[PDB]
Amino acid sequence: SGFRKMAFPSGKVEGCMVQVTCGTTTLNGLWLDDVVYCPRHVICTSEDMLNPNYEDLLIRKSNHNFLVQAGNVQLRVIGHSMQNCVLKLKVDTANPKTPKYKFVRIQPGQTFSVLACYNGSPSGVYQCAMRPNFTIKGSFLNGSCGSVGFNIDYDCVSFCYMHHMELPTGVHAGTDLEGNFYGPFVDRQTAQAAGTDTTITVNVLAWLYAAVINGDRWFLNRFTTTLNDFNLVAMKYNYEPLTQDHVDILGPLSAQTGIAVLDMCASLKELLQNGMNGRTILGSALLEDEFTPFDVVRQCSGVTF
Amino acid sequence: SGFRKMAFPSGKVEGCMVQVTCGTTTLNGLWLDDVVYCPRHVICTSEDMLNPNYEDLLIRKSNHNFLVQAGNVQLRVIGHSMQNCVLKLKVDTANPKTPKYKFVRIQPGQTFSVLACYNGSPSGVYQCAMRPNFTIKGSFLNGSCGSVGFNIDYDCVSFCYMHHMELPTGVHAGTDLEGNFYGPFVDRQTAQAAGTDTTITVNVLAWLYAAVINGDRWFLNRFTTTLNDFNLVAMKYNYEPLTQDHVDILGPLSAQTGIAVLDMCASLKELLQNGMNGRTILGSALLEDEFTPFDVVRQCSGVTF
Numbered sequence: 101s102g103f104r105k106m107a108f109p110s111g112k113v114e115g116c117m118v119q120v121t122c123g124t125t126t127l128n129g130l131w132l133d134d135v136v137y138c139p140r141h142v143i144c145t146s147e148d149m150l151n152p153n154y155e156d157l158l159i160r161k162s163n164h165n166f167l168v169q170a171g172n173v174q175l176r177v178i179g180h181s182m183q184n185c186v187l188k189l190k191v192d193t194a195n196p197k198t199p200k201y202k203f204v205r206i207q208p209g210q211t212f213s214v215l216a217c218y219n220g221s222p223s224g225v226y227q228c229a230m231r232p233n234f235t236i237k238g239s240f241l242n243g244s245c246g247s248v249g250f251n252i253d254y255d256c257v258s259f260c261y262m263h264h265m266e267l268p269t270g271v272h273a274g275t276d277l278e279g280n281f282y283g284p285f286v287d288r289q290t291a292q293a294a295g296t297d298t299t300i301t302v303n304v305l306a307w308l309y310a311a312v313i314n315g316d317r318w319f320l321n322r323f324t325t326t327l328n329d330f331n332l333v334a335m336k337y338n339y340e341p342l343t344q345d346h347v348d349i350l351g352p353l354s355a356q357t358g359i360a361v362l363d364m365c366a367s368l369k370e371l372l373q374n375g376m377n378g379r380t381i382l383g384s385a386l387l388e389d390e391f392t393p394f395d396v397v398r399q400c401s402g403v404t405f
Numbered sequence: 406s407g408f409r410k411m412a413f414p415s416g417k418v419e420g421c422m423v424q425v426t427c428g429t430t431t432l433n434g435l436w437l438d439d440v441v442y443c444p445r446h447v448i449c450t451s452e453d454m455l456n457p458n459y460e461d462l463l464i465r466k467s468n469h470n471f472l473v474q475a476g477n478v479q480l481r482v483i484g485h486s487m488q489n490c491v492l493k494l495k496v497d498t499a500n501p502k503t504p505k506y507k508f509v510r511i512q513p514g515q516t517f518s519v520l521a522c523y524n525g526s527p528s529g530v531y532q533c534a535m536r537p538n539f540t541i542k543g544s545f546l547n548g549s550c551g552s553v554g555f556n557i558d559y560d561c562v563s564f565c566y567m568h569h570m571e572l573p574t575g576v577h578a579g580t581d582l583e584g585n586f587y588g589p590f591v592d593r594q595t596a597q598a599a600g601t602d603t604t605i606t607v608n609v610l611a612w613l614y615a616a617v618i619n620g621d622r623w624f625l626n627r628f629t630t631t632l633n634d635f636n637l638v639a640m641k642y643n644y645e646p647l648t649q650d651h652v653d654i655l656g657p658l659s660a661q662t663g664i665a666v667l668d669m670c671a672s673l674k675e676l677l678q679n680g681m682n683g684r685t686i687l688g689s690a691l692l693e694d695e696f697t698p699f700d701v702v703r704q705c706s707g708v709t710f
């Protein structure tokens with residue numbers, strides 16, 4: 101029993117965290133095999149960040165301008181290249197602690213663990229979700245650039261995020277490990293406002309199923325809804341549209357609890373309408389949306405309570 | 406910016422997790438140097454749990470009855486002993502991944518990271534606090550016994566918890582690494598329950614300071630209170646008594662924000678008597694009490710390990 105916001109064990113990632121320095125700028129890098137992946141803005145000054153020409157800033161650099169530090173051992177850069185907004189620094193030594201890894205681009209709603217790092221040194225590990233507006237509600241201070249997001253299913257580390265910046269609203273923007281930004285964001289100091297955020301409906305539903313598995317049934321009702329009628333109500337509370345793909349993805353949880361997806365949809369409709377009335381669902385007074393259907397099956401028991 | 410429930414990087418602990426098997430029972434063990442620490446109930450059957458004489462059950466065991474597995478390598482047990490409710494299995498090989506460590510007994514209100522494991526394999530990591538009633542609100546399934554709680558103090562892993570059982574309310578009970586249970590619990594299948602829990606007042610205040618640091622000031626007011634008047638209000642709302650030691654521990658946060666401790670108490674008193682009035686503090690509709698003053702300073706300053 102119990103339901104916690106659970107992050108993957110960070111050990112496989114900690115062993116990849118290095119410090120990258122280009123002049124006055126110091127951030128984090130991910131050392132996998134003989135390559136160090138880091139944000140390309142490491143080559144910029146604060147003046148450069150307004151309208152940077154990365155190709156022009158990078159052409160003025162040599163391998164020895166990049167200082168890479170893996171703990172108290174300096175790595176020697178033998179090559180450099182840029183792939184979108186990520187700087188790939190070829191080093192003279194392959195990371196002996198390189199785990200089995202893949203680079204995955206995740207979709208909004210998908211969750212991951214973040215190993216927050218400062219000066220190539222892991223500070224903490226937390227869970228978060230890729231918001232529908234493509235930002236993440238992270239916990240990051242200056243020097244956290246290059247900290248990564250990942251999932252570890254079946255002993256393999258799937259890198260999905262590299263932190264690049266903090267937007268004016270306190271939320272964070274970053275890229276996949278191939279340098280492609282999530283969302284309409286750029287690595288420039290310009291008017292980039294996070295678009296209006298919405299609640300991840302499939303996740304809230306998954307968490308309601310987690311609550312049923314853990315014994316909470318107070319929010320359930322005798323009603324059902326059509327998928328279309330649920331959407332018309334949900335969009336009014338700034339909830340993401342629930343699609344047929346989400347209904348299918350919730351199938352196993354629906355079969356485990358005996359509560360059909362559109363019956364759990366009626367519960368969410370009522371919950372949005374009435375609020376909690378002084379009650380909590382899995383220790384929360386809010387409808388939690390940073391647990392995916394996959395996370396619920398991962399964490400929760402196979403036997404319903 | 407951002408404030409997440411953050412656990413310590415689990416890597417130093419992951420390298421110590423092994424699988425312990427005694428007959429039909431399989432749980433987790435902590436392998437530090439040449440000793441594997443695990444719950445002593447590993448030697449018991451389900452009929453034994455009703456009334457176990459651990460010394461008598463253990464005297465009937467030999468070293469080879471204990472199967473220890475560190476990944477896909479079997480460790481050979483060369484000795485065994487008991488220290489309170491922990492089984493210390495002397496093994497032939499010392500853990501090469503043994504980090505700098507101490508065994509610390511924590512007090513209620515203190516938080517720690519839990520590396521949940523199944524079959525000696527780390528599954529996830531989360532942050533939790535030792536409740537004033539000495540239970541932990543963990544997330545554990547069958548097979549999680551032997552999972553550990555820890556904090557990192559610079560380079561030193563301070564082991565503070567080993568998981569032993571789940572109480573009828575879904576909350577968890579365990580011991581320090583010397584086998585001494587936290588709370589009035591015994592390691593036996595008998596009627597046991599969690600005493601009425603209280604809210605960790607110093608931790609709620611610390612999280613209000615975190616909210617102020619992160620830009621939330623709606624709950625602040627022009628008022629102050631005496632420590633004694635605040636304690637009358639705290640006793641009414643099932644909050645732990647706030648002491649002069651807690652007031653001193655909150656000093657740095659008080660100086661950083663400019664909000665005196667008794668000034669933040671007057672904000673807490675207003676939230677307890679009136680509620681939040683439809684608002685949230687750091688994305689929560691409840692007053693969060695699982696962040697210590699040190700956790701707030703560590704996450705808002707970026708300490709590394």
Ligand SMILES: Cc1cccc(CC(=O)Nc2cncc3ccccc23)c1
Nearest residue numbers: 149240241242264265266287288289406
């Ligand atoms: C691409 C880009 C453009 C301009 C400036 C930057 C630096 C940046 O955003 N750094 C930070 C990253 N995360 C959290 C931060 C919190 C406080 C201060 C700085 C933070 C990056």
Ligand SMILES: Cc1cccc(CC(=O)Nc2cncc3ccccc23)c1
Nearest residue numbers: 101446545546547569570571592593594
């Ligand atoms: C000392 C003791 C007495 C009686 C029973 C036990 C076993 C026990 O409670 N194990 C578990 C621990 N955490 C989560 C569990 C979830 C489901 C089932 C079992 C779980 C221990």
Ligand SMILES: [Cl-]
Nearest residue numbers: 457458459460
């Ligand atoms: Cl006994």
